[PDB]
Structure formats: structure tokens, C-alpha cells
Amino acid sequence: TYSRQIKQVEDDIQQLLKKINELTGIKESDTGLAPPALWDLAADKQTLQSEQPLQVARCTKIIKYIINVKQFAKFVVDLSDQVAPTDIEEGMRVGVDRNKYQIHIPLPPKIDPTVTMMQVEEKPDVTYSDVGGCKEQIEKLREVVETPLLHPERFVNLGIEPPKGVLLFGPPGTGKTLCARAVANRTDACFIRVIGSELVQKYVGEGARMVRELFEMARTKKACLIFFDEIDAIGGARFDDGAGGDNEVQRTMLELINQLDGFDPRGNIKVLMATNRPDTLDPALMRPGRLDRKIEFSLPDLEGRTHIFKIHARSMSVERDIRFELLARLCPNSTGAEIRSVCTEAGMFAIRARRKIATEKDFLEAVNKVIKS
């Protein structure tokens, strides 16, 4: 009935769309201008007044100033309708025009595609109150990551240093990534996830660069929350033995540490270090001057298991009444990820029973199956 009505009406829509296409006719082929008009004569004229090249300014020698510019053609130029002389900066991207080469427009700095898309400006879809079994850990993380930011005058009155650096560690799967996502979503600051694999490249020179540009980007931004993951992958025991050929990763780790805290302030950057094997981590990095508030995620207790159970039960089609504390009791030594998989198994059991209700019986069957496997 309803399904057939759907099929009919969607057939009508497909027919309408093809009819529109054939009747009027809009396509691109190779390049196109489908949006009507788009006349851009003034655009051409101002492009001629512009369409400038860019390079990297080097030095402003004199106090009319002498800007020095380097690309496939060196140059020494200055002056422009632009003001804020060299925007009080030298190593920018100048953006200078042709035709006597003295008119400029400042540009941001070039950055490799890797970091460009590692910026990860997206907001993960997680929020607090969806976390159970690690109330103490989340309390610690909330304190460290928010008190310096949210009404932090109370945090400065006491004359106490602001902690900077937290390493999340624990068994594989405890809601560490979940809590990282939640903090990312809630926070309002330059957030930057980092993947360890992207820091391993073809021979020396790559990781150290990308790390340095990442760090200067964070410094340029007002306040950064960096989110290293795969720290187990990036940075390990400094010992060489046979790693005399593999010293590249160790080198990159060394530069990472130096930028974290070397002979220069590191800045308003708070670091999150995701891991599950917090022993091979190098001592220099693990130094508490760089990872202040290491947090440990443990297997949830009964209350945490129940809270995670109801959280996952947030979904609909579930039974009207379930007895979650017994569910948790039946699943001891179970990760929150295992609670999630138990809810998934209950849903799949409902489907394989052709039932639109997820019953406590379905939950019990799922628990039995997961326990047996």
C-alpha cells in the first residue's frame, strides 16, 4: 500500500526530472557556466589592475623601506597603496603585482596539503552527558581543559601555573576517543586532530617540517587544542640498536618534543595524547612538563555500565521497560564499546526476529552471543 504509493510517486519525480532535463537542457561537458548570466567585464578590468604574482618577502632594509622578494625572479621593491608596512612582518606571502612591481596585498602562509586538511575544522557529533563509567576521568579532563578557558580569572587568582598537556591511556576501547570527540565538539578554539601515520614519510625531512608548520599555525591562531592520536605510532623508545636506519621516526619525535617545550615558549596550546599502551612512550615526551595530567580510563563499574546502556538505548524502537542494572550485572568486565556492540546485537536480533521492538529478551540474547564470542 504505502510502499506502492512511494514507488509510484518517486517514479513521477524521476519522470519529471528527466522531462525537465530533456525539455530545457542544462549541461557542462568540459567547463561550464550553468548559472545564468555571470557577465564579468568589470571583473576582467580589475583582474588586469590585479592578477598579481606572489613571493616571500625577505627583509625591509631601511627605515622608505626596502623589501626583498624571491621567486623564479629575485627582486628588491617596496611601496604600495597597501599600508601597515609589510604588516609588521617579513616572511609573509607578499602578493605583489607586475608593472613596476610596487603594489601589494598580504597573504597567509603556504602550508602543505597534509596539515591543510588535518586542520579538521569539522565538529564531531558528541556531547557530554553521553559518557558513563569514567566520571572521575572526565571530571579531570573538564577541569584541565576548561577552567583555563571558562571564567579563568578564578584560575589565575591563586597564582598557580595553568596545566598544559594530558595523555589519555587505558585498555583498547574505553571511551577515550569518545571523550576526545566530546571535548572537540564542546570546545571553541582552534582544534586540530593529528594522525600519526601522516607524520611518517619517505625518508628524513618530512615529519619535522610538517610538525613545525603545524606548530607555527597553532601559534598564529589565538588558542589551540591539539589532539594527537597514534602517539604509539609516532615516537617510541630512543634506543637505536638496529634502528640506526629507522632513526627518522626518532628524529621527528625529537623535533616534536623540542616544539612542545624547548628554548622558546610553546604558547596557548593544550595537547591531548591518545594511547592504549602507555609504556613504550618515550621518557622525554612523557616528562610531566609536557603531559601534565595523564588520565587513565578503566573498565566501567556497574553504574557506568548501566549509564552507557541507557545512553545507547537513547535510540527508539527499544522496549518500553528494560532493567539496565541487571543488564550491566550480566555483562561484567565489559567495555563501553562492548555495551555499544550489545545494543547493536540486540537490534540485529530484533531484525532477525522481524521484530520492531528491542526487548530485554533481545538484549539477553545479544549478551549471551557476545559473551560466547
Binding site: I6, V9, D12, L16, K19, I20, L23, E28, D30, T31, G32, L33, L38, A43, D44, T47, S50, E51, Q52, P53, L54, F72, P113, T116, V120, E122, P124, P172, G173, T177, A180, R181, A184, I195, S197, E198, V200, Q201, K202, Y203, D229, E230, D232, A233, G236, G242, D246, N276, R277, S315, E338, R340, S341, T344, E345, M348, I351, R352, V370, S373
Partner: protein, 371 residues
């Protein structure tokens, strides 16, 4: 009610568009002349000698375009462009004089897809899969009906399983079931093997892994068939020797791709393993991989079914009886049965008789048995 909404508005579309547009077409003029005017004006917008490479985009109307000589020049784009196709690294078209962005054209990509996607619909289908009904139904539940019927999961609440492991001895139709899933499903299956990702140098393996995952996400919401991984990593060891350390990094990247910080599309992972006890305890984490499936050796009836399905395209003889081969109560995979059939056929061909014989199948049995 929702049906009422969609039907009402859909009829609104048909009526509005069809009637008004057909009125204008009946008075066709005032459209073709304008279209020709616009097309010739676009042509007038310089189309001499022209090409461009897009390093990046500043914002609407402004972007940086680099030429083979490194002509990085920044230019104000011309709105005539198609727009929204300006992904960094795209091949742009630039006016010879003003280097105005007016067009973009790549129409050519890395053939990695064409290499790792061969025979998308192999000759083996579920009919060719003789037996293993339980495993077949479970893998369908895990893979296909989530895609072919994205209604049940959506209405009930959960999302489908992401990673599914198929573990069993060396040869139980794992790749066969992968192929059948590919053929039956409309999605762009992806074959992958564990002996190629082990690259010569650091970062190469994880780089190609990430590229493979991104390709899977982009080109199609499909399956990725990761064959043996025990030759990779085998859990996270003390991480002492450089090669194994790098391979552990490769698995950790795999783990991030399987379930990372950001998100995951509608791409399902299917693992095939000879041995599972040795795999990373963390990788199989129930959040990531679920529905590990035994793929054991066929029993006697499954062996009958496998022989029958293999030999369906095999005109067995009247005297040839396919029970002396079921007689053997030892290791005989589907691959073993195929080898037995092929060896019997080849020996019959060698001994020149067009029709296979029971003795030929017997000899094929002895010469296919390894131990």
C-alpha cells in the same frame, strides 16, 4: 502523513514545472537567442592558449593558480566558471593574457581504482557457493540488506556492523564469498591483499592504506576486502625491530581508519584470516569489528554440494561416481575440490578420452592430497 506530504508536494512539482515550462516552450523564443548570446560571450571571454593548476582557493572570486613554469599567480576568478569543482590540485583553465580562471578539466585519475577493482562481478555467485547457508545469511545481514534495504536499521535505530572478520583454515571460500557479495551487491567492491601493503620504506604502507580507505569512501559506498593481515603486525609487539615497528604503525593507521576520531561513511570492511587467535586483540574490538564468522572445512554433505557446484560445468561420466571423493574424511577445502575436478579433467584430456573416469578422479584425489 509523511506519504501525504511527499505526494502532495511531488504533484505540485509536476504541475508547476511541466505546465509553466511547456507554456514558455510553446512560446519558445526569448530562450535560444539568449543562450547563443551567452555562449558566444563566454567564447569571447578569452579562449586562446590556456591551462591552469589550482594550488588552493582563497575564497569566492579569488584563488591562486600555478602554471608548469611555476606561474603561481593569484587571480580573481571569472564567475562563468562551473564553480564548486575547484578542489585543490584540479587542472584549471586560464586566459593566456590575464590568466583568468574560466574552466577546469581533469577527466583523468590515478588508475589505482582500475588496478584494485578487477572483474567486479566474478563468475562465482551464491549459486556457485555450494553450502554454508548460515554464514551466507549472516554475511548478508551484515553487508547487503543494510545497503539494499536502508529502511529497517533507520527505523529501528542502530547502524549496521562495520567490520566483519571471516576466519578459518587455509581455504574455505573466503575470497569466494567476497566475490559473491561483490557480484550480488551493486556497490563497487574492492579487492585487497596483505602482501602488497608491506612497502619498502617508512610511511609508504600507511600512506597507501589511507589512500585506499579514502578511495573506498569516495568512489562508492562499498566493501573493502582485506585479505590476510596476520602477516601484518600480529598485535602490537614490544616494537623493537624497525620493520615490525613500521608495520605496527600501519595497523594503527588501519585501526584509525576502521574507527577514528572524525567519522566513517557507508563503506563496510570484510577481513579474511587463516588464523585469528594471533590477531591484535584491540583491532577486533567489538566497536570496530563484529560478526566474526567461522569458515570451517566442509563436512561430507557440504563436500557433496561443493563437488556438485564445481562440476555443474563438468559433464561427468555415467560411470564417474562422485562419492569416492566424499569418502575421504580429511582436509578437502573448496579449493581442494576444485583442484580435484581440474586434475581429473586434465588427466582425462592427457589420456585422450573425452570422458572423465572414476579412476581419473581417484588419481586426482591422490595427487591433490598433500599429506
Amino acid at each position: 502523513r509523511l506519504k501525504l506530504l511527499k505526494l502532495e508536494r511531488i504533484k505540485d512539482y509536476l504541475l508547476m514545472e511541466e505546465e509553466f515550462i511547456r507554456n514558455q516552450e510553446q512560446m519558445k523564443p526569448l530562450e535560444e537567442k539568449q543562450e547563443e548570446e551567452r555562449s558566444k560571450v563566454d567564447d569571447l571571454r578569452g579562449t586562446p592558449m590556456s591551462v591552469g593548476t589550482l594550488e588552493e582557493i582563497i575564497d569566492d572570486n579569488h584563488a591562486i593558480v600555478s602554471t608548469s613554469v611555476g606561474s603561481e599567480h593569484y587571480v580573481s576568478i571569472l564567475s562563468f566558471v562551473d564553480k564548486d569543482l575547484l578542489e585543490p590540485g584540479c587542472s584549471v583553465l586560464l586566459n593566456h593574457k590575464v590568466h583568468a580562471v574560466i574552466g577546469v578539466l581533469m577527466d583523468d585519475t590515478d588508475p589505482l581504482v582500475t588496478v584494485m577493482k578487477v572483474e567486479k562481478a566474478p563468475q562465482e555467485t551464491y549459486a556457485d557457493i555450494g553450502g554454508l547457508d548460515n554464514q551466507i545469511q549472516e554475511i548478508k545481514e551484515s553487508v547487503e540488506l543494510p545497503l539494499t534495504h536502508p529502511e529497517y536499521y533507520e527505523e529501528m535505530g542502530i547502524k549496521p556492523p562495520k567490520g566483519v572478520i571471516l576466519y578459518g583454515p587455509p581455504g574455505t571460500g573466503k575470497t569466494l564469498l567476497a566475490k559473491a557479495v561483490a557480484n550480488q551487491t551493486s556497490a563497487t567492491f574492492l579487492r585487497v591483499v596483505g602482501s602488497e601493503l608491506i612497502q619498502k620504506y617508512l610511511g609508504d604502507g600507511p600512506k597507501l592504506v589511507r589512500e585506499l580507505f579514502r578511495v573506498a569512501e569516495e568512489h562508492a559506498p562499498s566493501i573493502v576486502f582485506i585479505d590476510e593481515i596476520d602477516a601484518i603486525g600480529t598485535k602490537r609487539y614490544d616494537s623493537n625491530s624497525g620493520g615490525e615497528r613500521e608495520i605496527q604503525r600501519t595497523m594503527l593507521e588501519l585501526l584509525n581508519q576502521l574507527d577514528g576520531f572524525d567519522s566513517r561513511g557507508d563503506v563496510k570492511v570484510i577481513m579474511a584470516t587463516n588464523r585469528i587467535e594471533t590477531l591484535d586483540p584491540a583491532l577486533i574490538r567489538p566497536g570496530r569489528i563484529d560478526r566474526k564468522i567461522e569458515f570451517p572445512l566442509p563436512d561430507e554433505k557440504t563436500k557433496k554440494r561443493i563437488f556438485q557446484i564445481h562440476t555443474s560445468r563438468m559433464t561427468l561420466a555415467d560411470d564417474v561416481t562422485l562419492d569416492d571423493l566424499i569418502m575421504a574424511k580429511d582436509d578437502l577445502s573448496g579449493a581442494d575440490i576444485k583442484a580435484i575436478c581440474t586434475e581429473a579433467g586434465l588427466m582425462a584430456l592427457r589420456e585422450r578420452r573425452m570422458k572423465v573416469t572414476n579412476e581419473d578422479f581417484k588419481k586426482s584425489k591422490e595427487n591433490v592430497l598433500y599429506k
